[PDB]
């Protein structure tokens, strides 16, 4: 049994809810929240900016030190950093950004990072300002992630479309 509440069941391991991811993290304090990161861990907009703002910029300070030491992530890759006030850990995952011309086949590689964690709170990778089709992102998620994933969809309209169209 876990703390996640109100989630619509999709499969054996994937759950979905219309939720503000900052607000969900603040309430649950999950072991792992996933950030929709870029390779530079520059948390300007979307989920990354929202999450970072909720940490009072401490996520960005930590991220800048990580990049200064390790250099950029790979598209499809990830790193584990602090969850600050939101979670125990933040898994920063880089899905391909269609608005930069990145290979959408890298979306499966991105989701494979989730399998290293038994339970996660996450957004749909490569959705929103990353430019991918969220219906596609949900399909790749269900077909790739084997661990227990609780997906927070920001748009109520999109949430309803994802549920209604789910095979
Ligand atoms: O899911 C997103 O794309 C997203 C974008 N903006 C946000 C702003 C505040 C809180 C959550 C957000 C989530």
> Can you give the residue ranges of every domain in the chain?
1-167
Q: How far is the CA of 26 from the centre of ligand 1 (A)?
A: 14
Q: How far is the CA of 49 from the centre of ligand 1 (A)?
A: 8
Assign residue 87 a region: left if phi > 0, alpha if psi is -120 to 50, beta otherwise?
beta
User: Which residues pair with residue 80 across a beta bridge?
Assistant: 91
* Residue 33 burial class via C-beta count within 10 angstroms: exposed 0-12, middle 13-18, buried 19 and up: buried
* Residue 104 burial class via C-beta count within 10 angstroms: exposed 0-12, middle 13-18, buried 19 and up: middle
Distances (CA, A) of 164 to 7, 10, 159, 160: 15, 11, 9, 6
Q: How far is the CA of 38 from the centre of ligand 1 (A)?
A: 15
CA distance 75 to 32: 20
For ligand 1, atom 9, name the residue with the nearest CA. Answer: 50
CA distance 51 to 70: 22
Experimental method: X-ray
- Is residue 105 a contact partner of residue 71, using CB atoms and an 8 Å limit? no
Q: With a 6 A CB cut-off, is 46 part of the ligand 1 pocket? A: yes
Q: Give the resolution in Å.
A: 1.0
- If one residue of 16, 19, 21 were mutated to test the ligand 1 pocket, choosing by the most ligand atoms within 8 A of its CB, it would be 21
User: Which residues pair with residue 36 across a beta bridge?
Assistant: 93
Nearest 5°: phi and psi at 166?
Answer: -75, 130
- If one residue of 154, 156, 158, 162 were mutated to test the ligand 1 pocket, choosing by the most ligand atoms within 8 A of its CB, it would be 154
Distances (CA, A) of 71 to 37, 74, 117, 123: 14, 10, 24, 24
* Residue 6 burial class via C-beta count within 10 angstroms: exposed 0-12, middle 13-18, buried 19 and up: exposed
Give me the residue label for tokens 């991811």: 21
Nearest 5°: phi and psi at 10?
Answer: -105, -55
Give me the residue label for tokens 């999109």: 158
Q: Which atom of ligand 1 is nearest to the CA of 155?
A: 1
Question: How many residues make up the chain in this entry?
Answer: 167
Bridging pattern class, strands 119-122 and 78-82: unpaired
Q: Which atom of ligand 1 is nearest to the CA of 128?
A: 3
Q: With a 6 A CB cut-off, is 128 part of the ligand 1 pocket? A: yes
One-character DSSP codes across the chain:
--S--SPEE-SSSEEEEE--HHHHHHHH--SEEEEE--TT----SHHHHHHHHHTTTHHHHHHHHHHHHH-PPPTT-EEEEE-TTT-SEEEEE----GGGT--TTHHHHHHHGGGGSSEEEEPPTT-GGG---HHHHHHHHHHH--SEEEEEES-HHHHHHHHHT--
For ligand 1, atom 11, name the residue with the nearest CA. Answer: 20
CA distance 42 to 40: 5
Q: With a 6 A CB cut-off, is 134 part of the ligand 1 pocket? A: no
Retrieve residue 100's tokens.
């930069």
What contacts 95, CB < 8 A, 6 or more positions away? 36, 75, 76, 106, 107, 110, 125, 126, 130, 132, 137
Closest C-alpha among 55, 112, 113 to residue 79: 113
> Taking CA 70 as the corner, what is the angle to CA 66 and CA 75, rounded to the nearest 5 degrees?
95
What end-to-end distance do the CA atoms of the chain give, in Å? 26
């Amino acid at each position: 049994v876990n703390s996640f509440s109100g989630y619509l069941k999709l499969t054996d391991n994937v759950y979905i809810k219309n939720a503000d991811i900052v607000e969900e993290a603040k309430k649950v304090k999950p072991t792992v929240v996933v950030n929709a990161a870029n390779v530079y861990l520059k948390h300007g907009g979307g989920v990354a900016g929202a999450l970072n703002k909720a940490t009072n910029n401490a996520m960005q300070v930590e991220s800048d030190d990580y990049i200064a030491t390790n250099g950029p992530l790979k598209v499809g890759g990830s790193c584990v950093l602090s969850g600050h006030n939101l979670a125990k850990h933040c898994l920063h995952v880089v899905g391909p950004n269609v608005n930069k011309g990145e290979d959408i086949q890298l979306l499966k590689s991105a989701y494979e990072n989730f399998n290293q964690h038994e339970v996660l709170l996450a957004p749909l990778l490569s959705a929103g300002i990353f430019g991918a089709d969220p219906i596609h992102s949900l399909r790749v998620c269900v077909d790739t992630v084997r661990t227990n994933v609780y997906l927070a969809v920001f748009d109520k309209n999109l949430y309803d479309k994802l549920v209604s169209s789910f095979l």
